[PDB]
């Protein structure tokens, strides 16, 4: 049972890494340099 639990923890770590890579892809697709303020004549 102990080794089964450790194996499932390892799988959970893999899943978390996959999810963070996918959201890295999404924020790669996003594009902005606004910094909450464009120059006042733009």
């Amino acid at each position: 049972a102990e080794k089964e639990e450790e194996r499932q923890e390892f799988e959970a770590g893999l899943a978390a890494n996959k999810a963070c890579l996918d959201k890295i892809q999404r924020i790669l697709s996003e594009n902005q340099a606004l910094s909450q303020n464009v120059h006042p004549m733009r």
């Binding site: 639990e5 923890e9 959970a12 770590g13 893999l14 899943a15 978390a16 890494n17 963070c20």
Partner: protein
């Protein structure tokens, strides 16, 4: 990027909040007051702390024996029987010093 290792919240990965409304002073008063409905085993599936893994095996339900739960704690019980005169003197010296 120091920790883009998977976050893996420990306690989230593995009741009394309703009692004390997530208030520290209420929880301190409670733990001084017992009044905790739930237990380490009763919440957490894997033992977190040292004395939690110490006391992970048990049941809170009053009508349980680990004896019937798993049969190897079955041990012949050669217990002394305190004789009636022995109890007489015991309780007697307890309540009356003479």
């Amino acid at each position: 990027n120091l920790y883009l290792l998977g976050y893996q919240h420990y306690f989230q990965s593995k009741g009394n909040y309703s009692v004390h409304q997530n208030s520290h002073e209420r929880y301190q008063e409670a733990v001084r007051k017992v009044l905790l409905k739930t237990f380490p085993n009763q919440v957490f599936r894997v033992p977190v702390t040292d004395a939690q893994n110490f006391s992970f095996w048990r049941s809170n339900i009053p009508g349980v024996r680990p004896e019937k739960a798993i049969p190897w704690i079955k041990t012949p019980h050669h217990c002394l029987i305190k004789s009636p005169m022995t109890r007489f003197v015991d309780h007697s010296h307890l309540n009356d010093k003479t």
